[PDB]
Design a protein around this ligand. Structure first.
Ligand SMILES: CC(C)(COP(=O)(O)OP(=O)(O)OC[C@H]1O[C@@H](n2cnc3c(N)ncnc32)[C@H](O)[C@@H]1OP(=O)(O)O)[C@@H](O)C(=O)NCCC(=O)NCCS
Ligand SMILES: CC(C)(COP(=O)(O)OP(=O)(O)OC[C@H]1O[C@@H](n2cnc3c(N)ncnc32)[C@H](O)[C@@H]1OP(=O)(O)O)[C@@H](O)C(=O)NCCC(=O)NCCS
Ligand SMILES: *[C@@H]1O[C@H](CO)[C@@H](O[C@@H]2O[C@H](CO)[C@@H](O)[C@H](O)[C@H]2NC(C)=O)[C@H](O)[C@H]1NC(C)=O
Ligand SMILES: CC(=O)N[C@H]1[C@H](Oc2ccc3c(C)cc(=O)oc3c2)O[C@H](CO)[C@@H](O)[C@@H]1O
Ligand SMILES: CC(=O)N[C@H]1[C@H](Oc2ccc3c(C)cc(=O)oc3c2)O[C@H](CO)[C@@H](O)[C@@H]1O
Ligand SMILES: *[C@@H]1O[C@H](CO)[C@@H](O)[C@H](O)[C@H]1NC(C)=O
Ligand SMILES: *[C@@H]1O[C@H](CO)[C@@H](O)[C@H](O)[C@H]1NC(C)=O
Ligand SMILES: *[C@@H]1O[C@H](CO)[C@@H](O)[C@H](O)[C@H]1NC(C)=O
Ligand SMILES: *[C@@H]1O[C@H](CO)[C@@H](O)[C@H](O)[C@H]1NC(C)=O
Ligand SMILES: *[C@@H]1O[C@H](CO)[C@@H](O)[C@H](O)[C@H]1NC(C)=O
Lengths: 550, 543
């Protein structure tokens, strides 16, 4: 409604005081321990009855804490903790009451982002898009008729899970309407965009076990499956480094500024490690005890105890490196965001041990230069979310996916046992996560961090994945009440969809110029249309059996 | 240092204290250009101290310099030297009025055998590296076990298309930024200008070679018409969406979308010529001079002649407002600058009238030389007629290849006859001159002489490829038909992956031909390798 943009409310401040230099400090409520950034400097009023006013633009995404203290006296005047709307015209008046108090007034009502659209506009847009697609499909055959008138099967629950993850990833990678909850969490906590990648690693591990056991029971030597695993991991790493990581619109690729790690690099490294582990210890899948009712046998874990032992050793290594690796110019065992986080006393300390290891082994230029904490915590250093330390927890979560595959493939005709074990695993992983985080975004022993790929992050997302599998496997596999109707085509063409949406970022169907580039509705509509078009492309590549696999 | 690629720093010293000298430059290859001012050199402040002015002159080909006084407006000397890349030329002029132009530093001249011998050396090095990398694949693994469509594709059309694809991948990436590996500014023929017409010719030949097989094997005409229409629509949509816009500048908008394009023109011509062939389709029949391939296509020939007449009439007779009728010139400063905004003439006027100025090629091939300020699309509306004509010439080549399958001599005789006829037509039209003649060879207008010249070249290439690769089998096209079978995928990939690392990386110095040429050769070799890899796995993409 003004020169504002993208969750930014203009806050006029009337310094009605006569002889006080007033400065205005602001800090979002999302910050755990952040410095009070300077917002605006409102000078003293020249005379009584003629206040001096200045214009400042506060944020809107999540809360706002305003601190007013005298610039010269360095004494607090008053504090506010308002939640300014998207395009509000809030006005703050500070004046003597008789000591000094500030009054906040809402000159113009906010647009109330996500309140107006809520679910009503979402349902309306979905219905309109569906009607338009159906009309286009029906009228498409009209042109063809005018001329005539003139003269071991793939598991479907895993496919639906991967399709859900892929749809969510395509939505949140394109922006997801540029909403704060559809983007990545700044440093800690969990958002909608933070869920997909751990789910992808979990499904990768489950598919690793499924494919491994299917190929081995087909009568194939381990020395050929090892070559397949190594080649697939190498292809993943190379594809990521060459195609996915760099933004070639900026310019040609130069090794001095090549981002070595990435999503596909991490996927390939973890795939190689966990698949080679499973190949090394690959027990044949045994038949059930013919009861299949409420069997308590833990043969699934007692047949994979070496893999579990090595995974726990790796997790202990991750904990030791995170909490006991002296980082120069940084507290040992740091988990904060740096920049202005933790009151700003460690500005060049994003990540801590993981960031130090990344900057040491790979160099500062070979890391993600725009980490998710840069926007909020003002981190000036380069931290890569897919670093080296986090690869250990990525391997751990891939192995948890392997465990889920073991659960769902050992007891193939014992769906009650499958659900019992999925419930048990979800419960125990949730208990571990709730012990580590203590139900807190930034408190607890190990908060839910994606950039660090925290152990609590892995446990929380693995519990979510186990619950999702518990919901999907009966409905989509056993009961058959559902088939993942809009989901499993991306589930089958995951790699194709990922590579395509990484390449065809700005292409017209997935991205077009907007009338209002600072509108949430326009961005959300564009991102939803792009996601729906990627689902349509995956469905087309399913109808014509074009399944790209590595 | 301060110089750029294909430029020489021309120092100019004037020993005259009574006449300021302004320096006018004009490239030798331009037909009729205004003498654009190069540098203004003031008079010498005192005797024995000539004023020094430094200017950079294009060294690609020719440099006509005229010095005339800025006050008396009278010329003092004229020189037509052809400078060299990264040179250092000092031009001293004194009252004796004569101009010396003594060269100080010898030019690098990267267009010299440093682009031939070095190219061969780079190719040898790349081949050796690839062979060494491929050799150590199975031997190491073995040593580690101790520690533990009724007829086949012609392959001549495929080799021709593969040559065209290699050329397009090389010259689209820049081709070393050489002047002869780019599109000639308006009239003229270069290595880049030869690619697209060959693609249209091969498209027509494949149109016939596939249409007759489809009709003879198991299919009807209505399903084939549906397939032709769907393929044309797909090509047009791909050209509009994926290929034409360069999305690195931002999201697509309708006010800045280029409606014409390479694939749009190919799809439109495919639709038109394939529909004509399907409508007038007759079985192929099994004589030193039969002439059946024309008696069996006389209706299509009549339609093509009518289309050619329409193209000629529109080009030479459509009244362009604020422009002479029958204008084949480039506008800008071309044709003595009397038509600053007339690029294309009738074809450009039709494009701007129908599709609008905003939906055209913002940066045509004449902007670099003739300084045109208007938008002219080489793949416009009017040139589609000549594209259809050459697609039908390719269809005629396919008719020759398919009628006389039994008698190879009956194919070579027709090929040499058609090549000679089209070469004679082109010689008559252009008067063996790039800028003279009735209709000079011009890719931007897709001139009729351009179509005839490139079709004669294509007929000669087919006449030298069909025997060698098919009749006696001297040489299958080892680096050629692998892209020949994946043409559409190769084009789409190099139109999508222009900037990706294997095909493009950062250079030590962007103003160097030995670097750009190596980059483009590596990219083309990698595209040939990718097409070969897809051929090995049989992942051919069609439609
Ligand atoms: C890389 C990626 C394809 C690996 O996932 P996957 O589950 O291993 O995917 P694929 O379908 O490629 O699986 C490969 C093999 O898994 C096996 N498999 C997969 N699903 C299976 C199932 N439901 N039942 C049995 N086997 C299965 C098969 O053997 C398949 O190969 P085959 O069909 O040739 O035998 C996938 O995780 C991905 O697309 N990642 C990129 C997305 C991402 O990481 N996003 C993060 C945010 S950017
Ligand atoms: C592929 C392209 C050249 C035109 O297609 P084509 O020449 O007809 O080749 P395709 O490989 O698409 O083949 C299409 C048909 O020709 C057939 N065909 C091609 N060569 C053949 C041969 N030698 N013998 C028999 N049939 C042949 C194919 O089998 C297919 O027929 P089907 O319908 O029976 O499957 C075109 O789409 C393209 O690549 N354009 C980009 C290149 C370009 O224009 N560059 C300009 C510079 S940017
Ligand atoms: C705004 O002014 C208040 C009032 O002084 C500051 O509060 C104290 O500032 C001193 C700095 O001299 C600190 O040592 C104290 O810890 C602060 N708190 C208390 C309770 O005394 C406040 O810090 C000022 N704002 C900023 C951003 O510095
Ligand atoms: C769900 C998610 O965002 N995952 C990873 C993320 O993927 C992305 C992130 C952003 C984009 C962008 C901006 C556009 C696009 O079209 O493609 C993307 C893909 O890239 C970062 C590492 O490269 C990490 O923050 C995340 O692990
Ligand atoms: C030999 C040839 O390719 N000619 C066509 C030409 O191709 C090009 C030209 C330029 C580029 C560029 C700039 C980058 C790229 O990576 O791709 C290209 C492809 O595009 C113009 C119309 O689009 C016309 O001059 C011709 O039809
Ligand atoms: C407030 O600051 C201004 C300079 O920005 C200064 O001129 C003025 O005197 C200050 N007010 C007081 C009361 O010191
Ligand atoms: C906010 O309200 C004040 C009150 O007068 C007004 O002057 C100002 O223009 C308003 N802001 C906008 C953006 O309309
Ligand atoms: C050359 O140009 C200068 C401008 O600096 C001018 O003063 C001088 O008169 C000119 N020479 C002649 C001969 O007019
Ligand atoms: C330079 O001066 C000469 C002298 O008359 C003139 O003929 C020529 O056209 C001039 N060059 C231009 C105007 O480009
Ligand atoms: C060109 O030669 C002159 C005369 O020797 C010299 O002063 C000048 O620096 C040279 N230019 C370059 C770029 O070396």
């Amino acid at each position: 409604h003004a020169e504002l943009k993208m969750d930014q409310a203009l806050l006029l401040i009337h310094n009605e005081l006569l002889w006080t230099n007033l400065t205005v400090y602001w800090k979002s409520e999302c910050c755990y321990h952040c410095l009070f950034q300077v917002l605006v400097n409102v000078p003293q009023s020249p005379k009584a009855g003629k206040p001096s006013a200045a214009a400042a633009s506060v944020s809107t995404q999540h809360g706002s804490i305003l601190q007013l203290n005298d610039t010269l006296e360095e004494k607090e005047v008053c504090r506010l903790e308002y939640r300014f709307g998207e395009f509000g015209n809030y006005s703050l008046l500070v004046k003597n009451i008789h000591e000094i108090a500030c009054d906040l007034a809402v000159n113009e009502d906010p647009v109330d982002s996500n309140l107006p659209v809520s679910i009503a506009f979402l349902i309306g847009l979905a219905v309109i898009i569906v009607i338009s697609f159906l009309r286009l499909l029906l009228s498409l055959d009209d042109f063809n008729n005018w001329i005539s008138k003139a003269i071991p099967p793939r598991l479907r629950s895993v496919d639906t899970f991967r399709g859900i993850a892929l749809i969510l990833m395509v939505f949140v990678n394109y922006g997801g309407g540029k909403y704060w909850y559809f983007k990545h969490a700044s440093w800690n906590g969990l958002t909608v965009a933070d869920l997909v990648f751990p789910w992808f690693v979990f499904i990768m591990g489950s598919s690793i076990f499924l494919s491994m056991t299917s190929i081995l029971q087909r009568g194939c030597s381990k020395f050929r499956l090892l070559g397949k695993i190594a080649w697939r991991s190498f292809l993943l790493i190379c594809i990521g480094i060459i195609i996915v990581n760099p933004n070639y619109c900026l310019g040609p690729l130069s090794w001095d500024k090549v981002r070595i790690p990435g999503v596909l690099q991490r996927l390939g490294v973890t795939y190689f490690v966990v698949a080679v582990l499973e190949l090394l210890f690959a027990k044949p899948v045994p038949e059930h005890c013919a009861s299949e009712r409420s069997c308590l046998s833990l043969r699934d874990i007692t047949s994979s105890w070496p893999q579990w032992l090595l995974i726990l050793v790796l997790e202990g290594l991750w904990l030791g490196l995170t909490f006991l690796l002296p980082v120069p110019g940084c507290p040992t065992g740091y988990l904060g965001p740096g920049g202005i986080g933790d009151f700003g006393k460690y500005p060049n300390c994003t990540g801590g041990a993981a960031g130090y290891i990344d900057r040491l082994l790979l160099g500062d230029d070979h890391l993600y230069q725009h980490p998710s904490s840069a926007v909020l915590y003002h981190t000036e250093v380069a931290y890569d979310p897919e670093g080296i330390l986090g690869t250990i927890n990525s391997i751990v979560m891939a192995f948890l996916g392997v465990q889920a595959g073991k659960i769902l493939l050992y007891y193939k005709a014992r769906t009650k046992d499958i659900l019992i074990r999925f419930t048990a695993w979800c419960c125990i992983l949730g208990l571990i996560s709730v012990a580590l985080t203590k139900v807190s975004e930034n408190e607890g022993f190990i908060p839910v961090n994606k950039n660090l790929w925290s152990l609590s992050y892995v446990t929380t997302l693995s519990s979510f994945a186990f619950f999702i599998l518990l919901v999907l496997y009966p409905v989509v596999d056993v009961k058959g009440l559902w088939t993942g109707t809009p989901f499993f085509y991306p589930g089958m063409n995951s790699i194709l969809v990922y590579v395509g949406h990484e390449v065809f970022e700005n292409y017209f169907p997935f991205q077009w110029k907007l009338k209002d580039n600072q509108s949430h509705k326009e961005h959300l509509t564009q991102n939803i249309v792009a996601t729906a078009l990627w689902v349509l492309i995956a469905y087309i590549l399913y109808r014509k059996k074009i399944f790209w696999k590595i």
